[PDB]
Write a protein that binds this ligand. Structure first.
Ligand SMILES: Cc1cc2nc3c(=O)[nH]c(=O)nc-3n(C[C@H](O)[C@H](O)[C@H](O)COP(=O)(O)OP(=O)(O)OC[C@H]3O[C@@H](n4cnc5c(N)ncnc54)[C@H](O)[C@@H]3O)c2cc1C
Ligand SMILES: Cc1cc2nc3c(=O)[nH]c(=O)nc-3n(C[C@H](O)[C@H](O)[C@H](O)COP(=O)(O)OP(=O)(O)OC[C@H]3O[C@@H](n4cnc5c(N)ncnc54)[C@H](O)[C@@H]3O)c2cc1C
Lengths: 607, 609
């Protein structure tokens, strides 16, 4: 079969047996989507992903897109375009789209589980397919007239881009200098050069592309607060019928040569620089750009973390399948007998350590993003957690930088174990793990770097939130701890919870002390990413232990066969993670409690 | 990036001369005719050549990789890379540390590896192709008198060389190889088998001959590695008196791998005696002692791979630092609330300084480790700089090699992640060299023996079979540093805790080994902990050697260092202090983890994964 090895079984376990998402299926918004149909959709897209989507994974990397300066377009490899058509022909670009735009209403938890398969098999294919989802965001933020255009864009399946970055404005979005000049008729002319724009051209995949562009109206103030958001289509069109008209003045000028994710065209995007204006329409006809654009950034951050998690999962399952069959060496208990029988490498302790590390992190990370997603619908959060809409939104906002930051960093790090499991063969392009590594390196950088994630988590999702979402999650962990076969795990979780509490307290002290000693704030910066990572490890351990508690119940009820093996694996993973990953957080807390500004005072010339 | 390679001769000289005192042996005994000024000039010279002509083709070799012709069984290398190789040859850099009677310049191994570091940072496959004369010296040392004549010819003519062990079924388990050797009446052998993953098995027209050193099992020999013999199998027959090249020998490349990185190094399937022409081999030293003889080569390859990883992390760090110094993004964190504050360069941000100091401390701690290791590779150096005799020096060098290789490879690759991150989205571009550093360096945890194999070697052969004598020696030096100003008081306290942690790990693992006398399966816990223990010892050594460097730096600052010297020394103090406070404490948790290993993960059904 394909490079892509899916895990629908673990997704359904999470959705139904752990979080109980099936309790909202058939009711209210999801009135006409039942549990059986949800399961069938997951199986179907898993097969699509393993089949036609994964089919062009290698081709997209080995025969990457080409920029044509004669036409200012990008050409994509034919096999990848065929994969995209398989996604469109099945309507998978409308997963979770609103019903009035042509979608099937479903819990966000199911939506992201469906998307995981595309992100494991060929993640750029989902990225090119995000057009309808962007149309919905344009719809939500649009005027009544603009809602008519967004409806057309969804129905016609136009592609889309999110256009923020400039050479001098990446992390600091507010430094952007792309300009917006209002015209007599109320449209705007956008003038500027944007960088690193995903999908800025996409060959003949679509009849149009909606660029959602941040730009600064003439006379507006500085920073992100002075930015506005503009609908800038590649082609003008008839606002009533949708008929494609004249080219608009927004042109790709370059395609980047990247380590990985090569089939995703990443382009310099010039607005108003090629002799015709780039006409844009102010979104919602209000000046509120960074808030509006964050509707998109939130989804992109969720997507990036889920991509990284999807990629670790197929990396792990590839390594596991390889290890089961590779014969090498004798059993360690016979190591001095040079005539001892040769064994498969799953018999070697270091390989079992490696595989269980990969397994526990892959499944823990899957639990985290599905858990995060259960807070993205008010109805699901109410039904499965008993939490109201306001707290649910805050908890989702808390968890997003974990999914993105901790997901991105962990997946790339543990893929190292996946590749190592293949030995020298892991270094070959014949196997997919080296491409997994290259494709996933970008996940720590785009949609906000890890440092930006960690700063968001602490400054905005905890301090500005006055710790409400954080206290809620901590209370659920404490409840699980308070509650026999999981006594040792619960003790290790209690240490880990106290460690994270200590880190939060130290960092909060460093921030609060900055009012009298400005440089104190630097210790927050020094510790922020380690703190984010510690919270991710704590959440992984808790959710794995919760899974093991369910697995114990199902084994006690009489599970057999492949179910029994699955549940045994959950108990083993939970115990391994508690005993080998959580304790490190104690040393990390002590490190954070002793941070100093020596490294900030050092002359730059001494580095 | 063509001028991708950023060298650090200053840090090399600091280690060689101010810390370890390798200049004490320069101008005396074996190094009679090499003085400290010449050694420094050599470092500067190869560093310049590396930054120029050798680095020039780094990108080319990866973007325009070798092409295999299966009908001629040869590889074509890109022209720019062959021009880099010729610059290497024209300067004699393939003969660094070669024995004088083979045409080399005698020198401490610590200087030799510091010189080679520059090639490994600039274009590591170029050094690998250039290891022929080094191999010729190993062949010489293990050869008959007649073979020594051939080895002298091969060195003088600059022949390339390969080490040929691996087969599809015999990678970590070398002893599983099935390639066979059939004795001929005239005393030569015919080698029959297919080997895999052979580095440099063809090399276009770089050389007039290649020496394949091939492990094979004489017909009727016993199993495992002890049954293997080592054979000299030249690509071309040659005139044993003059070296004149003769008929093609029966050893042909039949495939060339497509790899994630290190692409310009042709990695080859090598077929011996499969094309109707015998692959004639000569039994090395005319004795049957294959695995022992080949480990002379493996030991050097493991040193090279570790030094390669370390060299690559160093130039990745310096590339990241130079980018960070110029990249303006965001406000100072003390002004984050003020959206009209001045924009600052990113070295002002705490997370970036954290990243950069993490990169620095590991790059420099790793450099200190490989150079420290090299000081035990000459008896004369180990005596002059450490006061240890030849037997202990060899055991210490053997102890440290799996650290250099296993800890060096894993650490360099992991910390290059920080280097790439420092560039932001630009770090994901091939326009910058970091993504190629990452791809080129991933292989270092795998070839010349995987990390797990390094950790098993370290524990069972270099500690237990050694009865702990080399490990006890190094521990004693760490303890003596701790026991000896109080400006390093906190660092010495942290080092003492780390030393106690590593001792605790060693005791727990040794405990599991003794328990295996009674319950065989207890040995698995040694396996589960072995790699974490190897990494822990590497962290301890890094922190100790950085603290030693800090003590030297404090002396030089106290004496009145100014300007760029002052900045250099200040950075050593900061690195040692940062590493002690942010890396070493984690070893406490790792000790407690190792103390609680169990066999649950061993007893789990494979079906449960
Ligand atoms: C493949 C790819 C696709 C992309 N697609 C898009 C797209 O479709 N749309 C779009 O708008 N953008 C896109 N981008 C841009 C991407 O979001 C930026 O690269 C990213 O936000 C980082 O910005 P930068 O590259 O300018 O790095 P910088 O902001 O210059 O960061 C450099 C380093 O400084 C650190 N740093 C910066 N500011 C701070 C701070 N205040 N505190 C602490 N550390 C800091 C960063 O963490 C990083 O380590 C893409 C980028 C890539 C690589
Ligand atoms: C680029 C490249 C160049 C190479 N060049 C050469 C060359 O010039 N000459 C040459 O002779 N070889 C060469 N090799 C071979 C290389 O040394 C082997 O790939 C390496 O030894 C690992 O062997 P293997 O690939 O068969 O992996 P395997 O031995 O199959 O290992 C697979 C996994 O099992 C683990 N494992 C295996 N045995 C044990 C054990 N007993 N205990 C615990 N874990 C175990 C490994 O650690 C790994 O995680 C090269 C390889 C590469 C990738």
């Amino acid at each position: 079969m394909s490079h892509y090895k899916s895990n629908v079984r673990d997704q359904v376990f999470n959705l139904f047996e752990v979080f109980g998402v099936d309790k909202v299926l058939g009711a209210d918004k999801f009135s006409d989507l039942d549990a059986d149909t949800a399961r069938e959709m997951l199986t179907e897209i898993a097969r699509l992903a393993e089949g036609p989507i994964a089919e062009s994974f290698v081709e997209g990397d080995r025969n990457p897109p080409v920029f044509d300066p004669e036409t200012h377009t990008v050409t994509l490899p034919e096999g990848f375009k065929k994969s995209m058509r398989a996604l469109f022909d099945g309507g998978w670009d409308k997963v979770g789209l609103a019903e009035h735009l042509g979608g099937i209403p479903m819990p966000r938890a199911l939506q992201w589980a469906l998307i995981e398969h595309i992100l494991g098999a060929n993640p750029a294919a989902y990225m090119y397919a995000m057009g309808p989802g962007m149309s919905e965001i344009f719809y939500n933020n649009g005027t009544d007239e603009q809602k008519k255009w967004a409806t057309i864009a969804a129905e016609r399946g136009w592609g889309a881009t999110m256009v923020l970055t400039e050479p001098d404005a990446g992390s600091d979005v507010g430094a952007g200098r792309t300009k917006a000049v209002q015209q007599p008729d109320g449209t705007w002319h956008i003038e500027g050069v944007k960088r690193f724009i995903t999908s800025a051209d996409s060959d003949d995949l679509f009849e149009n592309i909606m660029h959602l562009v941040l730009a600064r109206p003439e006379g507006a103030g500085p920073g992100t607060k002075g930015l506005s958001l503009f609908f800038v289509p590649k082609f003008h069109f008839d606002h009533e019928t949708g008929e494609i008209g004249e080219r608009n003045g927004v042109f790709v000028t370059n395609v980047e040569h990247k380590m990985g994710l090569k089939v995703s065209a990443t382009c310099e995007l010039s607005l108003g620089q090629h002799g015709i204006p780039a006409v844009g329409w102010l979104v919602g006809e209000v000046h509120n750009g960074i808030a509006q654009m964050f509707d998109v950034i939130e989804q992109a951050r969720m997507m990036v973390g889920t991509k990284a998690i999807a990629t670790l999962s197929t990396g792990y399952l590839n390594a596991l399948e390889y290890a089961k069959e590779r014969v090498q060496g004798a059993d360690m208990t016979q190591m001095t007998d040079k005539t001892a029988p040769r064994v498969t490498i799953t018999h070697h302790p270091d390989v079992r350590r490696s595989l269980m590390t990969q397994k526990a992190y892959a499944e823990g990370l899957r639990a985290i993003y599905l858990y995060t997603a259960t807070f993205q619908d008010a109805e699901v959060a109410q039904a499965v957690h008993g939490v109201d809409g306001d707290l649910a939104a805050r908890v989702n906002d808390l968890l997003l930088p974990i999914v993105k930051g901790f997901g991105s960093e962990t997946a790339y790090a543990k893929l190292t174990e996946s590749l190592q499991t293949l030995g020298g063969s892991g270094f070959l392009q014949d196997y997919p793990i080296e491409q997994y590594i290259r494709d996933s390196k970008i996940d720590s950088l785009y949609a906000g770097t890890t440092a930006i994630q960690a700063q968001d988590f602490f400054f905005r999702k905890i301090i500005r939130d006055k710790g409400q979402a954080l206290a809620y999650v901590a209370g659920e962990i404490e409840q699980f701890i308070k509650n026999g076969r999981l006594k040792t795990e619960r003790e290790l979780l209690a240490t880990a919870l106290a460690d994270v509490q200590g880190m939060a307290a130290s960092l909060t002290g460093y921030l609060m002390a900055a009012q009298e000693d400005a440089a104190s704030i630097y210790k927050v910066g020094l510790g922020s990413v380690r703190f984010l990572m510690a919270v991710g490890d704590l959440l992984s351990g808790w959710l794995l232990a919760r899974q093991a508690a369910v697995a114990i119940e199902k084994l006690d009820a009489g599970a057999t066969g492949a179910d029994k093996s699955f549940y045994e694996g959950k108990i083993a993973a939970a115990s391994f993670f508690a005993k080998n990953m959580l304790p490190l957080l104690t040393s990390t807390r002590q490190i954070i409690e002793n941070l100093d500004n020596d490294v900030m005072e050092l002359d730059e010339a001494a580095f």
